Point group: D2
Amino acid sequence: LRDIDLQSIQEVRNYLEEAKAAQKILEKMTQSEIDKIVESMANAAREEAGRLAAMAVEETGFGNVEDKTLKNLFAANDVYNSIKDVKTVGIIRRDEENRVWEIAQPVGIVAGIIPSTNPTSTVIFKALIAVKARNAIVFSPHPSAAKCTAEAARIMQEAAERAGAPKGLISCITQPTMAATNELMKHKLTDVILATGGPGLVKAAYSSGKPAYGVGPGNVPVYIHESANIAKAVQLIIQSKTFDYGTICASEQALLVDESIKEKVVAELKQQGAYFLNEEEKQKVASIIMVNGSLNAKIVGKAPQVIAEMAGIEIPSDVKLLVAEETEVGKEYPFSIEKLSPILAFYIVKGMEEASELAQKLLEVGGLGHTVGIHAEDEKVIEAYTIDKPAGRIVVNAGTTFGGIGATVNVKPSLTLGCGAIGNNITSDNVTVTHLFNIKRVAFGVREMPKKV
Amino acid sequence: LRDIDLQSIQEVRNYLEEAKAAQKILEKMTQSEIDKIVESMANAAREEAGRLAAMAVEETGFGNVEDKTLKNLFAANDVYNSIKDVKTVGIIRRDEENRVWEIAQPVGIVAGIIPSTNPTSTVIFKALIAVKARNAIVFSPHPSAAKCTAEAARIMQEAAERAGAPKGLISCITQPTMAATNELMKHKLTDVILATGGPGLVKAAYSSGKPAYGVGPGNVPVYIHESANIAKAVQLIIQSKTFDYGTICASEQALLVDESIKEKVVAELKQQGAYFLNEEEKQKVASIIMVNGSLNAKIVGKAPQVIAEMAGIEIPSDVKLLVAEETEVGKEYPFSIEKLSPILAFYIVKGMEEASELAQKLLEVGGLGHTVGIHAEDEKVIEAYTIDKPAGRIVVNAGTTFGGIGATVNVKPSLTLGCGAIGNNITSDNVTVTHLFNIKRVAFGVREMPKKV
Amino acid sequence: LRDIDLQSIQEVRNYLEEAKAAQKILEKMTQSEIDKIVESMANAAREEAGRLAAMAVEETGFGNVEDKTLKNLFAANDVYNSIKDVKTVGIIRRDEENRVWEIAQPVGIVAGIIPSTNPTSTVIFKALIAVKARNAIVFSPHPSAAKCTAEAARIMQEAAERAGAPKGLISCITQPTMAATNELMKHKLTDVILATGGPGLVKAAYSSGKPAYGVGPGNVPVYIHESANIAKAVQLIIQSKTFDYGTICASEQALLVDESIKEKVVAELKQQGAYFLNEEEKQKVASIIMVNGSLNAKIVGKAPQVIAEMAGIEIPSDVKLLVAEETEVGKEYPFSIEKLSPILAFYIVKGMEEASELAQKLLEVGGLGHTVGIHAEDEKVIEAYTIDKPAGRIVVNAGTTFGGIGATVNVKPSLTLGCGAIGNNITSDNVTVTHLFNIKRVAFGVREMPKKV
Amino acid sequence: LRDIDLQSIQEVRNYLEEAKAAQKILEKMTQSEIDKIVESMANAAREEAGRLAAMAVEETGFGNVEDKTLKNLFAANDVYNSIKDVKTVGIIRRDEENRVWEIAQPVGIVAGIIPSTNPTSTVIFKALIAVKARNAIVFSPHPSAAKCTAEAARIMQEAAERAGAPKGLISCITQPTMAATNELMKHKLTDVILATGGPGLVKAAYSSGKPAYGVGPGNVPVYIHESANIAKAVQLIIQSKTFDYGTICASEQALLVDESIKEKVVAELKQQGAYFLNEEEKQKVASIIMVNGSLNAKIVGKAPQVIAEMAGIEIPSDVKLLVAEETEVGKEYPFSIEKLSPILAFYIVKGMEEASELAQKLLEVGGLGHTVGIHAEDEKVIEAYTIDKPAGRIVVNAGTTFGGIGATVNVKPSLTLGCGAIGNNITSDNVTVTHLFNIKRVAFGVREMPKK
Ligand SMILES: [Mg+2]
Ligand SMILES: [Mg+2]
Ligand SMILES: [Mg+2]
Ligand SMILES: [Mg+2]
């Protein structure tokens, strides 16, 4: 075979056949044996966190090395700790009085689609949950992130083998193509797809004929209520928003601010490193946010100074993020969409009801089912505001990046955030190890069936 | 007539838009208002169980009215009782230690695909679980069951309306066509597909671009170990196998019997109404079990006497099931496949190990992930036999029809039995109300994110 | 509004069924009855040519009324004269020495796809050749020209009918949709597709499952050799290029001019109304020629003054066309593409070999198999230049608009110009009446077949 | 084996790229150089006719070696003779009074789809007409005839190359797959599809995005009018019908016979080797004509004795064809469909009018646009009968096999019989060399364009 599309198809087929053999071997191991493999994988991810981070920044041009290192550690530490004690081998629950017990059943071979924004960390995370549940996994990288994705996969497989795992358990397409992605998603041997990517790739996953856990995009609106701790709220928002220069789907995109505290919030934002664009600077930044009707890849995950330069504006070197005041919401209004960069929209609101109506509109521009935030000290207000928001993660008094993924609030640590039915997803959960094994129920007859009505 | 396809598309579009408006109204109600609607629906199903049963037998030619009535009552009583106390409105859980509230979120509009074998009971089952989780539902019948399916939906909607539900909540396609099925599965307003049907239609649901809960087919092997109470085992098996003349996917298809108790088992089966075919009779029956290389629809749900007539053999009028001693397994051995009728294969085995190898082979002929059975009093044998069977329902000392669906063993009452990844499904659960709402998590800041490494 | 797609499908189905019935009636008529019908149609077109021209300019904003009026007359007169004496009924050829005779066989129902640039004239031309060949025809308009296209079809039907034609012989989709176009191209009653449109629609026609005659796009290069009558060649070029403000695919897009007459040709161009853009103005005009990577629709068929304003430059009010001197060819050099407007590129060449090289490059930019031109009085040069050019119409000493369609050179009058295999078409012919009937051959035994080798 | 699909796709891409290069070199040759290449090809086909015939019978199980040898010679002789003097290089026509020239332009690369019934003869025919028009051609065989089809191709290429043709001009997919068929039909470099096969491949060819010449199936009804020379009609009918055991699409499938001569026709048929089935025998043969609502592949191109064994009937050795009297027409009546084997239907009619009505109904069962036949000496009846038949080939006083392909009546020699719009084809012509080059017209200004 000479041509790269055919070669990539053959490569996927080889990987899946090898994965099938590897998973048969893995399924026979004890819980201790599995847990030892997962622990070794987590240890290698930890050791390799910085180096993988630097590969990703260099290859993709997104983000910064210190934050990608922390993203990798989040996968190596937080994800690992949330699954290390989960029972995944044999009988995992007995219910003596109902005369049922539950047996864990691996799904088999998982197809992992990896994003360009979180390439190495998503590999670490998916490799850990897949292998803990006793599956093999075959990865498909984004073409912009092919080399670092593959290196992360190799490190996981080699760490797994050192602890006794079989060859071919963890693999990665080396030459990404549409043909190979299509083969991986539709192949006979593929059992479950974990599709972490854009809406089109997720749509393909749910068109594949295979069971799939997809995600949806975010466009996270955050309400700062007049009861907020303003300095703390601003601190949390800025740390979350500028993390890896805004590459995570759960990051803040718009602030909705009660008019009674707007002056204080602005001053606090400015003090903590935000640059407020004037009407002319806003137009110039706006004109590079979108090209040809969608987000400009060239601003994704870029420092505020790089964005400033691209837009032809002039800012201080210590600026942490750009902010623009906004009144409108929609695709024709670039500051109201998901920006995946250190840029925030700033909407003034009269109170909670106007905030909710704006939040609903912003979610409808490419954020349904994903994440919202609120900063407030009034529980009544928090309860009334949050109850009807279409998001699987409703983050209170925390940065939405770190809350969404379960770093700083107690949802399951994950880099695959299901957006529920409203987001065209099978679940609203943070996807984790329990999504990658089936439960079999052994159940005894305890009632008699009548055969007369 | 030329344009029934276009009219059926239009009808789907009308139902979904009416379903959209209805669900919005439903979603605003209290738990008690929802529960009153569900209760009224259950009551009406109970009252109409016999009339729906009769419509289904006459229209499809499958089964008998007594058993179909019981099947409807299973949906009206067992399913109702298993969901009536489930919380589905608002905050369903507050986790004070983890600082997380769980909010129940309806998926929206469910597309319910209905099989020709369990037409009215599946409608009852799906309508109850859909409405209890605060959804609208649009049904799609098999063409050979369009009238009884639509009548069951009509009765569910009228019952719901009587107790306060909005018009348009529950609807059913009246003119089934490929175009309409396609429209329903792919339409922008459809949120989740419940696909109960053949592997073809389920594959279509997982190809639709939408989240789906599919099923897989059964081909249930049942092991009678030498330790079994033989009279009781045979009774449970015959009651289950002949229920509705064998139309339920969980019903027994092959018995695997320890040689040491073969003669007793055969004699007990004969005593309880089984007719063992001789070699000439076997071959005549085998000829009408499949046409092309697939199950012959004309024997599905037929009394033994009808089948005898079809195969041109004669049998006593009191015969309850046909049995055929067999040694081979494969698509080309018609007695080893799923027969969906009162025909049972009979395999002799030396012990448990040989039983497992045959069970495994039978499941591979179109039963993976579905159901298995075993009859035994030796607990260690039970434990050893059951641990490695690829079936979501592993039924011990009960009829597999009634065990699988949760009538006589404690799995969730359901007529949509997921077969997990091994059967191309997103779950191995008995599908129930918890599969039709997403959980949103309101989660408070409880940890700090480290700024550096 | 929601169901306009479904209504348009039903509309197509009605038209096709009525056309089938109409065509059956028409096929039984004599040659003289057919010719009377065709004559009536042509007279009606001749009478309506001005009115339909004004409708098309009004609805599409392309071109001008005087030139569209002449375009309609081309179809009502030239096309009509080229077919009125063609034999299309019964035996059309007798070969007595070969013992064979030919019988004309109508193709049946023709699907005619109509462009936005030539909406009324293409309808006239197609209706004439279809009915002359004893076919029915169902038209599909471009959306931006639906009204004037439908009105042209109506006038043709009513004229046919006045002369004795059946109802439903000529029809037109009134609400164009993708669904209707698809239905028309693929319907079981559709016999032959005339696809006059962009490469996307023609590709759809060759993917329809049906026999199709398509076109390709033009990008016509014209060589002015030093032997040319310069005043006459510039006059021919200008009249052709500015006709309907350059909407026709066969219109000149680039001039290739011998260095030795460069100054004379430039001067002659200016004298006859050409405005040569300077570097400043070039860049401004280029900015509006392409939006995204394709031709800007807003310049199509616009007077040079409109284009000047759009580009924000000032030109004298008597300017008939803009000209830009160029050296590069390719899809990123906007002056080298097909411009469908009164803009002309202008290349200097040392002589014939460099002219050929450039013409080949220019046709590769979206003109393959369509049209080329040369002005020259040297016969040897004409022969050597034309022999190897990939164009079905090779126009000598004439404007290419009028030449390509057969107004001023002797190719068959047509508005559907096949670009041959090189342009992804079944023919390189100017499509006309002989493409719309099949020939049947009645042939007698004249030789004996050997029985043995 | 797992990835033969991928290998076959790569093979197609290699052939197309080499085809491209080859055609570019071929296009520069003189008419004289082209004609020498074509002649050399036709010579080699002639020499290899018997050998190819034996391979095809062995590989496919269809027909017999003698008739297949004749079929290959028809391509090597009749097709060659019909194209060898056609002008195809450069300027092919000049017109001083209209001031127009015509230049022949090769289509480029031809994808030739080859049926299982005529596998080697169709390769010879398509290669000759494609290379004569100065094209390259890539063949796609039916899986049942892969080896003999590739060998026919190899022989043409070798012969062409001996006479100076470039490498890669003529090629053939060696392992047929769906993937490879799809690739060849849809590839960027493919210019024209010649689709000779069942309605399904033909549909795929007109669904490919590419210009295509398809065929349609035959179901040829033949009318024997009371004015016919009966002994001669029967002979022509039997020789045509039994040729290669009935594998050619133009072959007779049903006789429509004037009541007034019925007895003589029956007697004459029997005398010339026909076996008339009794009612019981008819039911048994009917039972194996159709399998699963379509023509049973297992009777295609089989001797009548072989068909007799399959049906459980007993017939003499010297029988040449089976005949059944029939009254009904439709898919539910196996004797009324296209049988591609030495089986004929026998209908009695009162006269021409019932014959036409019957002929129309038989064509609507899978024969539209293809071929029809009549045997008669009354010129007026011939004219009256033929004028309204929807067939591109209307064969008079000849066997329809040999008439339809142009062996024994003057239509262009061809094994790709277009069935017109009524047969879902772009033409009703016997496809030949002129369908494989475009005409470019060099045309001079002769008129002025006005205003108002
Ligand atoms: Mg699998
Ligand atoms: Mg929705
Ligand atoms: Mg037709
Ligand atoms: Mg080409």
